[PDB]
Amino acid sequence: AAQTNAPWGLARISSTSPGTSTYYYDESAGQGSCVYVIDTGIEASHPEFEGRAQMVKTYYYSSRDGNGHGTHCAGTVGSRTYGVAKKTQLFGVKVLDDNGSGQYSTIIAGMDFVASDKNNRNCPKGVVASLSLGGGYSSSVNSAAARLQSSGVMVAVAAGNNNADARNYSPASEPSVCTVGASDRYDRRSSFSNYGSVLDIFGPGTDILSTWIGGSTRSISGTSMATPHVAGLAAYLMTLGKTTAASACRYIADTANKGDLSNIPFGTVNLLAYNNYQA
């Protein structure tokens, strides 16, 4: 399948070259997979989600996304226009308040929630969790991410936006999950992207158009935007049967575009997520 005039990041993940605008992908489109977006919530009524999104958990007075961040990330995973995996099922877990903040204890609870809650959902092709959040190093936060991954969920986490070594941030620094840095449309490391040996992969993160609250759209930047590209890619590849939750991060690294990014610090992987789709 081909989506013309796609957001640059979708085009990038199906291309061996920057500078194109059509997204190419197998029509299975992540059908039968599920992606949990652990964030500020999801505006599930947005026409872009086509009834495939739902809130399953909140730790606050509402499950609605009063911020937009979680809706934007969910849109990059799986919205019809802005999403990588256009037929996946999206489940929202609101661990961040409407200012985008959350306590680590709440975030940990939300990760353990997903590890159990997947047993209440139908995801025959597999389960992914997208965590566009983080703060300073916490062994307890890393352990929660490691548990979620061990339970059979492909965990993708943002590297962080400090232009610093991600070893000092959590859950970015957890070795067993997939830690995602950000790139721009010219294949440069995004100016804010964290780096370091704990990163596994880069995805598009600068000037990413996606869904927003109020039934709207907007373009924003962050490792928060790169992470759902990788989460959606994992769901798509799991639906194709090419990999599993336990092996998807390694598979994505194996099949990435290699050595094509600029301003990658020595010791950080130079790998850009790629779907390897041949029409």
Side-chain angles (χ1 to χ4, degrees), residues 1-26 28-86 88-257 259-279:
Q3 177 191 352
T4 55
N5 301 109
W8 79 262
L10 301 190
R12 190 70 194 83
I13 68 161
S14 61
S15 186
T16 50
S17 282
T20 69
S21 62
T22 306
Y23 176 37
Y24 306 111
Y25 62 96
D26 188 277
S28 60
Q31 201 147 54
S33 70
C34 304
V35 186
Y36 286 82
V37 180
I38 304 176
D39 213 290
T40 64
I42 307 174
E43 186 174 279
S45 65
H46 200 302
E48 277 282 316
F49 295 124
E50 317 179 291
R52 291 177 290 102
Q54 60 186 117
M55 281 312 291
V56 299
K57 180 64 174 177
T58 182
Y59 297 88
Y60 305 92
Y61 57 81
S62 177
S63 65
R64 298 188 84 125
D65 182 10
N67 182 278
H69 184 269
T71 293
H72 194 276
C73 294
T76 297
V77 176
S79 69
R80 65 193 185 184
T81 305
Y82 312 99
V84 173
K86 298 177 187 300
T88 194
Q89 289 285 320
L90 298 161
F91 298 131
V93 179
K94 181 171 174 64
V95 300
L96 303 180
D97 69 18
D98 288 342
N99 300 322
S101 310
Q103 297 294 285
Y104 268 168
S105 59
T106 301
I107 292 162
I108 289 166
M111 283 194 264
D112 285 319
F113 171 90
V114 174
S116 180
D117 183 74
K118 67 175 193 291
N119 299 311
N120 287 325
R121 314 294 167 190
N122 286 297
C123 311
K125 300 300 187 187
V127 185
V128 181
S130 197
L131 283 68
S132 290
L133 55 75
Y137 180 86
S138 159
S139 59
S140 293
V141 171
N142 282 13
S143 176
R147 286 194 297 278
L148 180 55
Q149 176 70 51
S150 166
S151 84
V153 177
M154 187 293 178
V155 180
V157 311
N161 303 329
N162 319 92
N163 187 36
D165 201 312
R167 71 196 305 165
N168 285 319
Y169 298 90
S170 288
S173 60
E174 167 51 39
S176 70
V177 303
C178 211
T179 300
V180 183
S183 65
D184 78 12
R185 72 173 73 243
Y186 302 108
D187 283 352
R188 303 178 293 210
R189 181 169 68 88
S190 304
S191 67
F192 48 80
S193 184
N194 284 353
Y195 51 82
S197 61
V198 73
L199 268 68
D200 299 289
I201 192 67
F202 284 80
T206 298
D207 297 329
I208 306 304
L209 180 60
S210 190
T211 41
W212 201 251
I213 54 169
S216 74
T217 59
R218 66 177 60 186
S219 173
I220 57 163
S221 300
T223 62
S224 287
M225 288 55 266
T227 301
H229 281 90
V230 172
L233 178 60
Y236 165 88
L237 294 170
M238 293 153 57
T239 287
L240 285 175
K242 299 181 164 288
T243 191
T244 71
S247 53
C249 188
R250 187 169 308 200
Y251 180 84
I252 287 165
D254 287 350
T255 59
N257 283 309
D260 295 322
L261 298 173
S262 68
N263 201 35
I264 300 293
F266 198 83
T268 295
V269 295
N270 194 328
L271 299 171
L272 180 64
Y274 174 52
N275 74 358
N276 202 31
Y277 176 67
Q278 163 189 320

Short mmCIF file of all heavy atoms in Angstrom, two decimals, residues 8-20 178-190 193 199-206 208 225-227 229-230 233 237 248-262 264 268-277, unseen atoms left out:
data_model
loop_
_atom_site.label_atom_id
_atom_site.label_comp_id
_atom_site.label_asym_id
_atom_site.label_seq_id
_atom_site.Cartn_x
_atom_site.Cartn_y
_atom_site.Cartn_z
N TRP A 8 6.45 13.37 6.91
CA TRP A 8 7.78 12.97 6.48
C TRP A 8 8.28 11.75 7.24
O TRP A 8 9.01 10.92 6.68
CB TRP A 8 8.78 14.14 6.58
CG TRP A 8 9.29 14.42 7.97
CD1 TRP A 8 8.83 15.38 8.83
CD2 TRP A 8 10.37 13.76 8.65
NE1 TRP A 8 9.55 15.35 10.00
CE2 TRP A 8 10.50 14.36 9.92
CE3 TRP A 8 11.23 12.72 8.30
CZ2 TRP A 8 11.45 13.95 10.85
CZ3 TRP A 8 12.18 12.31 9.22
CH2 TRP A 8 12.30 12.94 10.47
N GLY A 9 7.91 11.63 8.52
CA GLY A 9 8.40 10.52 9.32
C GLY A 9 7.88 9.17 8.86
O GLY A 9 8.61 8.17 8.90
N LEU A 10 6.62 9.11 8.43
CA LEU A 10 6.10 7.88 7.86
C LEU A 10 6.84 7.53 6.58
O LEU A 10 7.27 6.39 6.39
CB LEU A 10 4.60 7.98 7.60
CG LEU A 10 3.71 8.27 8.80
CD1 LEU A 10 2.24 8.10 8.41
CD2 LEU A 10 4.06 7.37 9.98
N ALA A 11 6.98 8.51 5.69
CA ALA A 11 7.75 8.26 4.48
C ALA A 11 9.16 7.79 4.82
O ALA A 11 9.70 6.89 4.16
CB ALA A 11 7.80 9.50 3.59
N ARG A 12 9.78 8.39 5.83
CA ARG A 12 11.16 8.04 6.16
C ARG A 12 11.29 6.59 6.60
O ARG A 12 12.26 5.91 6.24
CB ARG A 12 11.71 8.97 7.24
CG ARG A 12 13.22 8.83 7.45
CD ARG A 12 13.98 9.39 6.24
NE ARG A 12 15.39 9.03 6.16
CZ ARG A 12 15.84 7.88 5.67
NH1 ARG A 12 15.01 6.92 5.27
NH2 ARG A 12 17.15 7.71 5.54
N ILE A 13 10.33 6.11 7.39
CA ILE A 13 10.47 4.76 7.92
C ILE A 13 10.26 3.69 6.86
O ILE A 13 10.61 2.54 7.10
CB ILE A 13 9.66 4.48 9.20
CG1 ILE A 13 8.18 4.50 8.90
CG2 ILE A 13 10.08 5.44 10.32
CD1 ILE A 13 7.37 3.82 9.95
N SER A 14 9.72 4.03 5.70
CA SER A 14 9.62 3.06 4.62
C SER A 14 10.58 3.36 3.47
O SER A 14 10.39 2.87 2.35
CB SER A 14 8.18 2.90 4.12
OG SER A 14 7.64 4.11 3.60
N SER A 15 11.63 4.14 3.72
CA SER A 15 12.54 4.57 2.67
C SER A 15 13.99 4.31 3.03
O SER A 15 14.39 4.40 4.20
CB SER A 15 12.37 6.05 2.38
OG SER A 15 13.16 6.41 1.27
N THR A 16 14.78 3.98 2.01
CA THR A 16 16.24 3.96 2.13
C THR A 16 16.88 5.33 1.95
O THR A 16 18.10 5.44 2.05
CB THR A 16 16.85 2.97 1.13
OG1 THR A 16 16.33 3.24 -0.17
CG2 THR A 16 16.53 1.53 1.52
N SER A 17 16.09 6.38 1.71
CA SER A 17 16.61 7.72 1.49
C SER A 17 15.70 8.75 2.14
O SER A 17 14.47 8.58 2.14
CB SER A 17 16.65 8.06 -0.01
OG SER A 17 17.75 7.46 -0.65
N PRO A 18 16.25 9.84 2.66
CA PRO A 18 15.42 10.97 3.06
C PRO A 18 14.87 11.70 1.83
O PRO A 18 15.29 11.46 0.69
CB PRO A 18 16.41 11.86 3.83
CG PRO A 18 17.72 11.61 3.14
CD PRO A 18 17.70 10.15 2.75
N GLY A 19 13.93 12.59 2.09
CA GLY A 19 13.45 13.49 1.05
C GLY A 19 12.33 12.97 0.19
O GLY A 19 12.12 13.51 -0.90
N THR A 20 11.60 11.94 0.62
CA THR A 20 10.41 11.50 -0.09
C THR A 20 9.19 11.71 0.80
O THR A 20 9.31 11.99 2.00
CB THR A 20 10.53 10.04 -0.55
OG1 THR A 20 10.51 9.18 0.59
CG2 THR A 20 11.84 9.83 -1.30
N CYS A 178 13.43 -1.01 24.51
CA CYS A 178 13.91 -0.39 23.28
C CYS A 178 13.92 1.12 23.48
O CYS A 178 12.86 1.75 23.52
CB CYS A 178 13.00 -0.77 22.11
SG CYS A 178 13.85 -0.87 20.53
N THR A 179 15.11 1.71 23.56
CA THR A 179 15.26 3.13 23.84
C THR A 179 15.48 3.90 22.54
O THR A 179 16.38 3.57 21.75
CB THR A 179 16.43 3.35 24.81
OG1 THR A 179 16.15 2.65 26.03
CG2 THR A 179 16.61 4.84 25.10
N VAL A 180 14.65 4.92 22.32
CA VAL A 180 14.48 5.54 21.00
C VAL A 180 14.96 6.99 21.02
O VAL A 180 14.40 7.83 21.74
CB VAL A 180 13.02 5.48 20.55
CG1 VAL A 180 12.86 6.06 19.14
CG2 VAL A 180 12.51 4.05 20.62
N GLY A 181 15.97 7.29 20.19
CA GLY A 181 16.37 8.66 19.94
C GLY A 181 15.61 9.27 18.76
O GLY A 181 14.88 8.57 18.06
N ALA A 182 15.81 10.57 18.55
CA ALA A 182 15.06 11.31 17.54
C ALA A 182 15.98 11.85 16.45
O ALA A 182 17.08 12.33 16.73
CB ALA A 182 14.34 12.50 18.16
N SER A 183 15.49 11.81 15.21
CA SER A 183 16.14 12.39 14.04
C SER A 183 15.21 13.37 13.33
O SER A 183 14.00 13.41 13.58
CB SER A 183 16.56 11.27 13.07
OG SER A 183 15.41 10.62 12.55
N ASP A 184 15.79 14.17 12.42
CA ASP A 184 15.04 15.14 11.64
C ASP A 184 14.95 14.72 10.17
O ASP A 184 15.49 13.70 9.75
CB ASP A 184 15.55 16.57 11.86
CG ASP A 184 16.84 16.90 11.10
OD1 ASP A 184 17.29 16.14 10.22
OD2 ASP A 184 17.39 17.98 11.41
N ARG A 185 14.24 15.54 9.39
CA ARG A 185 13.93 15.16 8.02
C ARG A 185 15.14 15.16 7.10
O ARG A 185 15.04 14.65 5.98
CB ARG A 185 12.86 16.08 7.44
CG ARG A 185 13.38 17.47 7.15
CD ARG A 185 12.36 18.33 6.42
NE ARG A 185 11.26 18.74 7.29
CZ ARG A 185 10.00 18.39 7.12
NH1 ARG A 185 9.64 17.56 6.15
NH2 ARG A 185 9.07 18.88 7.94
N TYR A 186 16.26 15.71 7.55
CA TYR A 186 17.51 15.67 6.80
C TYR A 186 18.47 14.63 7.36
O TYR A 186 19.67 14.68 7.05
CB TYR A 186 18.15 17.05 6.76
CG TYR A 186 17.24 18.07 6.12
CD1 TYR A 186 16.63 19.05 6.89
CD2 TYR A 186 16.94 18.01 4.77
CE1 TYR A 186 15.78 19.97 6.33
CE2 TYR A 186 16.09 18.94 4.19
CZ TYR A 186 15.51 19.91 4.98
OH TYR A 186 14.65 20.84 4.43
N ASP A 187 17.96 13.68 8.14
CA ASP A 187 18.77 12.60 8.69
C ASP A 187 19.85 13.12 9.63
O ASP A 187 20.95 12.57 9.69
CB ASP A 187 19.34 11.70 7.60
CG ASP A 187 18.31 10.73 7.03
OD1 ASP A 187 17.19 10.64 7.58
OD2 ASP A 187 18.65 10.03 6.05
N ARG A 188 19.56 14.18 10.36
CA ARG A 188 20.43 14.66 11.42
C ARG A 188 19.84 14.24 12.77
O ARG A 188 18.62 14.21 12.94
CB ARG A 188 20.49 16.19 11.38
CG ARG A 188 20.96 16.74 10.04
CD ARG A 188 20.98 18.26 9.99
NE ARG A 188 19.64 18.83 10.06
CZ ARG A 188 19.29 19.98 9.49
NH1 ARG A 188 20.14 20.69 8.78
NH2 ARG A 188 18.05 20.42 9.66
N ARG A 189 20.71 13.92 13.72
CA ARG A 189 20.24 13.76 15.09
C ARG A 189 19.49 15.02 15.51
O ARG A 189 19.98 16.13 15.32
CB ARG A 189 21.40 13.50 16.05
CG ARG A 189 20.93 13.31 17.49
CD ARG A 189 22.03 12.79 18.42
NE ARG A 189 23.10 13.75 18.65
CZ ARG A 189 23.11 14.67 19.60
NH1 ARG A 189 22.08 14.83 20.42
NH2 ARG A 189 24.19 15.42 19.78
N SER A 190 18.28 14.85 16.05
CA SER A 190 17.55 16.01 16.53
C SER A 190 18.36 16.74 17.59
O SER A 190 19.08 16.13 18.38
CB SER A 190 16.18 15.61 17.09
OG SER A 190 15.41 14.89 16.14
N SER A 193 17.91 15.52 21.14
CA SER A 193 17.84 14.09 21.41
C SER A 193 18.95 13.65 22.36
O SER A 193 20.12 13.95 22.14
CB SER A 193 17.93 13.28 20.13
OG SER A 193 17.77 11.90 20.43
N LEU A 199 20.90 3.71 23.90
CA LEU A 199 19.96 3.82 22.79
C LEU A 199 20.05 2.58 21.91
O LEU A 199 21.13 2.04 21.67
CB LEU A 199 20.27 5.04 21.94
CG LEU A 199 19.52 6.32 22.32
CD1 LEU A 199 19.98 6.84 23.67
CD2 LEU A 199 19.70 7.37 21.24
N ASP A 200 18.90 2.16 21.41
CA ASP A 200 18.81 1.04 20.49
C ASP A 200 18.54 1.45 19.06
O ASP A 200 18.89 0.71 18.14
CB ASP A 200 17.70 0.09 20.94
CG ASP A 200 17.97 -0.48 22.30
OD1 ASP A 200 18.88 -1.32 22.42
OD2 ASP A 200 17.29 -0.09 23.27
N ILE A 201 17.92 2.61 18.85
CA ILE A 201 17.37 2.94 17.54
C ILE A 201 17.01 4.42 17.55
O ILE A 201 16.78 5.01 18.61
CB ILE A 201 16.13 2.05 17.26
CG1 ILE A 201 15.66 2.14 15.80
CG2 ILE A 201 14.99 2.40 18.23
CD1 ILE A 201 16.63 1.56 14.80
N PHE A 202 17.01 5.03 16.37
CA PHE A 202 16.45 6.36 16.14
C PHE A 202 15.19 6.26 15.30
O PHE A 202 15.05 5.39 14.44
CB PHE A 202 17.45 7.27 15.43
CG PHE A 202 18.53 7.79 16.33
CD1 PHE A 202 19.62 6.99 16.66
CD2 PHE A 202 18.43 9.04 16.89
CE1 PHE A 202 20.59 7.45 17.52
CE2 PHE A 202 19.41 9.50 17.75
CZ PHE A 202 20.49 8.70 18.06
N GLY A 203 14.27 7.18 15.57
CA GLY A 203 13.10 7.38 14.75
C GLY A 203 12.85 8.85 14.50
O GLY A 203 13.43 9.72 15.16
N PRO A 204 11.94 9.17 13.57
CA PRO A 204 11.63 10.57 13.28
C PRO A 204 11.06 11.28 14.50
O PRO A 204 10.08 10.83 15.11
CB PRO A 204 10.59 10.47 12.16
CG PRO A 204 10.89 9.16 11.48
CD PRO A 204 11.31 8.25 12.61
N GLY A 205 11.66 12.42 14.85
CA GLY A 205 11.24 13.13 16.04
C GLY A 205 11.15 14.64 15.94
O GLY A 205 10.63 15.28 16.85
N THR A 206 11.62 15.24 14.85
CA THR A 206 11.54 16.69 14.68
C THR A 206 10.45 17.04 13.68
O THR A 206 10.45 16.52 12.55
CB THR A 206 12.89 17.26 14.23
OG1 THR A 206 13.87 16.98 15.24
CG2 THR A 206 12.81 18.76 13.96
N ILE A 208 6.92 16.59 13.69
CA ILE A 208 6.08 15.42 13.45
C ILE A 208 4.61 15.82 13.55
O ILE A 208 4.12 16.17 14.63
CB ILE A 208 6.39 14.30 14.45
CG1 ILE A 208 7.88 13.95 14.44
CG2 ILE A 208 5.49 13.08 14.19
CD1 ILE A 208 8.42 13.57 13.09
N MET A 225 8.01 11.83 20.14
CA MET A 225 7.43 11.62 18.82
C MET A 225 8.13 10.49 18.07
O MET A 225 7.51 9.81 17.23
CB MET A 225 7.57 12.90 17.97
CG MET A 225 6.67 14.11 18.31
SD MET A 225 6.72 14.75 20.00
CE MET A 225 5.34 13.87 20.73
N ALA A 226 9.42 10.28 18.35
CA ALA A 226 10.16 9.19 17.73
C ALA A 226 9.71 7.84 18.26
O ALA A 226 9.56 6.87 17.50
CB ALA A 226 11.65 9.38 17.98
N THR A 227 9.48 7.76 19.56
CA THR A 227 9.10 6.52 20.23
C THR A 227 7.88 5.84 19.61
O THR A 227 7.96 4.65 19.30
CB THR A 227 8.90 6.81 21.72
OG1 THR A 227 10.12 7.33 22.26
CG2 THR A 227 8.52 5.56 22.49
N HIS A 229 6.78 6.04 16.59
CA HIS A 229 7.12 5.48 15.28
C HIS A 229 7.64 4.06 15.45
O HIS A 229 7.27 3.16 14.69
CB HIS A 229 8.19 6.32 14.56
CG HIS A 229 7.69 7.58 13.91
ND1 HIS A 229 7.64 8.79 14.56
CD2 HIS A 229 7.26 7.82 12.64
CE1 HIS A 229 7.20 9.72 13.74
NE2 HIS A 229 6.95 9.16 12.56
N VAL A 230 8.53 3.86 16.42
CA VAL A 230 9.11 2.54 16.68
C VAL A 230 8.06 1.59 17.24
O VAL A 230 8.01 0.40 16.87
CB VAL A 230 10.34 2.69 17.59
CG1 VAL A 230 10.85 1.34 18.04
CG2 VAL A 230 11.44 3.44 16.86
N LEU A 233 5.91 0.61 14.41
CA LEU A 233 6.67 -0.29 13.54
C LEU A 233 6.70 -1.70 14.11
O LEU A 233 6.50 -2.68 13.38
CB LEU A 233 8.07 0.26 13.31
CG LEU A 233 8.99 -0.61 12.45
CD1 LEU A 233 8.38 -0.82 11.08
CD2 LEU A 233 10.38 -0.03 12.36
N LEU A 237 5.32 -5.06 12.30
CA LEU A 237 6.17 -6.20 11.99
C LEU A 237 5.69 -7.47 12.70
O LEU A 237 5.84 -8.58 12.16
CB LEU A 237 7.60 -5.90 12.39
CG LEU A 237 8.29 -4.78 11.60
CD1 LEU A 237 9.62 -4.41 12.26
CD2 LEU A 237 8.51 -5.19 10.15
N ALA A 248 11.61 -7.91 18.96
CA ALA A 248 11.32 -6.87 17.98
C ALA A 248 12.34 -5.74 18.01
O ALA A 248 12.69 -5.19 16.96
CB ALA A 248 9.91 -6.32 18.17
N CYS A 249 12.80 -5.33 19.20
CA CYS A 249 13.80 -4.27 19.24
C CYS A 249 15.05 -4.68 18.48
O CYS A 249 15.58 -3.91 17.67
CB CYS A 249 14.13 -3.90 20.69
SG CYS A 249 15.19 -2.44 20.82
N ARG A 250 15.52 -5.90 18.72
CA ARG A 250 16.70 -6.41 18.04
C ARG A 250 16.46 -6.54 16.54
O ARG A 250 17.35 -6.24 15.73
CB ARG A 250 17.08 -7.76 18.64
CG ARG A 250 18.38 -8.32 18.14
CD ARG A 250 18.80 -9.52 18.97
NE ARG A 250 18.82 -9.24 20.40
CZ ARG A 250 19.50 -9.95 21.29
NH1 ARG A 250 20.23 -11.00 20.93
NH2 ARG A 250 19.45 -9.61 22.58
N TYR A 251 15.27 -6.98 16.15
CA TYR A 251 14.94 -7.10 14.74
C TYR A 251 14.94 -5.74 14.06
O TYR A 251 15.45 -5.59 12.93
CB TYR A 251 13.57 -7.77 14.60
CG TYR A 251 13.12 -7.93 13.17
CD1 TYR A 251 13.53 -9.02 12.43
CD2 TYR A 251 12.30 -7.00 12.57
CE1 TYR A 251 13.14 -9.18 11.12
CE2 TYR A 251 11.89 -7.15 11.25
CZ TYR A 251 12.32 -8.25 10.54
OH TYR A 251 11.93 -8.42 9.24
N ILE A 252 14.36 -4.74 14.71
CA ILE A 252 14.34 -3.39 14.17
C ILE A 252 15.77 -2.86 14.02
O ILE A 252 16.13 -2.28 12.99
CB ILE A 252 13.43 -2.48 15.02
CG1 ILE A 252 11.96 -2.83 14.78
CG2 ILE A 252 13.71 -1.01 14.75
CD1 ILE A 252 11.01 -2.27 15.81
N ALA A 253 16.62 -3.12 15.01
CA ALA A 253 18.02 -2.72 14.87
C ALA A 253 18.70 -3.48 13.73
O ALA A 253 19.45 -2.89 12.94
CB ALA A 253 18.76 -2.92 16.19
N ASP A 254 18.44 -4.79 13.62
CA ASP A 254 19.02 -5.61 12.54
C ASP A 254 18.68 -5.07 11.17
O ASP A 254 19.48 -5.18 10.24
CB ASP A 254 18.45 -7.04 12.57
CG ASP A 254 18.97 -7.90 13.70
OD1 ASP A 254 19.92 -7.52 14.42
OD2 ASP A 254 18.37 -8.99 13.87
N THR A 255 17.45 -4.60 10.99
CA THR A 255 16.92 -4.24 9.69
C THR A 255 16.93 -2.74 9.45
O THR A 255 16.40 -2.28 8.43
CB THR A 255 15.50 -4.81 9.53
OG1 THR A 255 14.64 -4.29 10.56
CG2 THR A 255 15.51 -6.34 9.58
N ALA A 256 17.52 -1.97 10.36
CA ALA A 256 17.52 -0.52 10.27
C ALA A 256 18.38 -0.03 9.10
O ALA A 256 19.26 -0.73 8.59
CB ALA A 256 18.10 0.06 11.57
N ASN A 257 18.12 1.21 8.69
CA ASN A 257 19.08 1.92 7.86
C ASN A 257 20.28 2.29 8.73
O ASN A 257 20.12 2.87 9.81
CB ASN A 257 18.44 3.17 7.27
CG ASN A 257 17.53 2.85 6.11
OD1 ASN A 257 17.92 2.16 5.18
ND2 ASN A 257 16.31 3.35 6.16
N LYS A 258 21.48 1.95 8.26
CA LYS A 258 22.69 2.00 9.08
C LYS A 258 23.65 3.06 8.57
O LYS A 258 23.95 3.10 7.37
CB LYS A 258 23.39 0.64 9.06
CG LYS A 258 22.49 -0.51 9.41
N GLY A 259 24.16 3.87 9.48
CA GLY A 259 25.20 4.82 9.13
C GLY A 259 24.73 6.02 8.35
O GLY A 259 25.56 6.71 7.75
N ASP A 260 23.43 6.31 8.36
CA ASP A 260 22.89 7.39 7.53
C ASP A 260 22.62 8.68 8.29
O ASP A 260 22.33 9.70 7.66
CB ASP A 260 21.62 6.92 6.80
CG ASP A 260 21.90 5.81 5.80
OD1 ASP A 260 22.96 5.85 5.14
OD2 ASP A 260 21.06 4.90 5.67
N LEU A 261 22.71 8.67 9.62
CA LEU A 261 22.43 9.86 10.41
C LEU A 261 23.71 10.64 10.67
O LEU A 261 24.78 10.06 10.86
CB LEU A 261 21.79 9.48 11.74
CG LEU A 261 20.45 8.76 11.59
CD1 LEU A 261 19.98 8.26 12.94
CD2 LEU A 261 19.41 9.67 10.95
N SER A 262 23.59 11.96 10.70
CA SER A 262 24.68 12.84 11.07
C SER A 262 24.57 13.29 12.53
O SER A 262 23.50 13.24 13.15
CB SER A 262 24.74 14.04 10.12
OG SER A 262 23.62 14.88 10.29
N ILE A 264 25.83 11.85 15.16
CA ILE A 264 25.69 10.74 16.10
C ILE A 264 26.99 10.66 16.90
O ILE A 264 28.05 10.44 16.30
CB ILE A 264 25.40 9.41 15.40
CG1 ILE A 264 24.10 9.48 14.60
CG2 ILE A 264 25.37 8.27 16.42
CD1 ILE A 264 22.86 9.62 15.45
N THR A 268 27.33 5.86 20.14
CA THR A 268 25.89 5.75 20.00
C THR A 268 25.59 5.07 18.66
O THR A 268 26.27 5.34 17.67
CB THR A 268 25.26 7.15 20.03
OG1 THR A 268 25.46 7.73 21.32
CG2 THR A 268 23.76 7.11 19.72
N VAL A 269 24.60 4.17 18.65
CA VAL A 269 24.26 3.49 17.40
C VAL A 269 23.82 4.49 16.34
O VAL A 269 23.14 5.49 16.62
CB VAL A 269 23.17 2.42 17.61
CG1 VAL A 269 23.67 1.29 18.50
CG2 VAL A 269 21.88 3.04 18.16
N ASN A 270 24.19 4.22 15.09
CA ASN A 270 23.74 4.99 13.94
C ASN A 270 22.77 4.10 13.17
O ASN A 270 23.12 3.49 12.15
CB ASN A 270 24.92 5.44 13.10
CG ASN A 270 24.54 6.52 12.10
OD1 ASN A 270 23.41 6.56 11.59
ND2 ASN A 270 25.47 7.41 11.82
N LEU A 271 21.54 4.02 13.68
CA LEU A 271 20.52 3.11 13.16
C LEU A 271 19.19 3.86 13.15
O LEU A 271 18.79 4.42 14.17
CB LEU A 271 20.39 1.88 14.07
CG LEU A 271 21.63 0.99 14.22
CD1 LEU A 271 21.39 -0.04 15.32
CD2 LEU A 271 21.98 0.31 12.92
N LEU A 272 18.52 3.84 12.00
CA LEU A 272 17.27 4.54 11.79
C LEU A 272 16.20 3.53 11.42
O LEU A 272 16.37 2.76 10.47
CB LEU A 272 17.42 5.58 10.68
CG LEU A 272 16.18 6.42 10.33
CD1 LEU A 272 15.75 7.29 11.50
CD2 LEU A 272 16.48 7.28 9.11
N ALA A 273 15.09 3.55 12.16
CA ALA A 273 14.05 2.54 12.01
C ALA A 273 13.54 2.50 10.57
O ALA A 273 13.29 3.54 9.96
CB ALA A 273 12.89 2.87 12.94
N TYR A 274 13.35 1.28 10.05
CA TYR A 274 13.01 1.06 8.65
C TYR A 274 12.16 -0.20 8.53
O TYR A 274 12.50 -1.23 9.10
CB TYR A 274 14.31 0.91 7.85
CG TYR A 274 14.17 0.54 6.40
CD1 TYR A 274 13.34 1.24 5.54
CD2 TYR A 274 14.91 -0.52 5.88
CE1 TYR A 274 13.24 0.89 4.20
CE2 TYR A 274 14.81 -0.88 4.55
CZ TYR A 274 13.98 -0.18 3.72
OH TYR A 274 13.88 -0.54 2.40
N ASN A 275 11.05 -0.12 7.77
CA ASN A 275 10.13 -1.24 7.68
C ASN A 275 10.51 -2.26 6.62
O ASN A 275 9.88 -3.32 6.57
CB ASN A 275 8.66 -0.78 7.51
CG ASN A 275 8.34 -0.26 6.12
OD1 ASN A 275 9.19 -0.17 5.22
ND2 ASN A 275 7.07 0.10 5.93
N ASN A 276 11.52 -1.99 5.80
CA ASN A 276 11.98 -2.93 4.78
C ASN A 276 10.85 -3.45 3.91
O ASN A 276 10.86 -4.61 3.49
CB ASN A 276 12.78 -4.09 5.40
CG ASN A 276 13.70 -4.75 4.40
OD1 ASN A 276 14.20 -4.12 3.47
ND2 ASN A 276 13.93 -6.05 4.58
N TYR A 277 9.85 -2.61 3.64
CA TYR A 277 8.72 -3.06 2.83
C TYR A 277 9.05 -2.91 1.36
O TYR A 277 9.44 -1.83 0.90
CB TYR A 277 7.47 -2.25 3.17
CG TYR A 277 6.29 -2.61 2.29
CD1 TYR A 277 5.67 -3.86 2.38
CD2 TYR A 277 5.78 -1.70 1.38
CE1 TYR A 277 4.59 -4.19 1.57
CE2 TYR A 277 4.70 -2.02 0.57
CZ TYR A 277 4.11 -3.26 0.67
OH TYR A 277 3.03 -3.59 -0.12
#
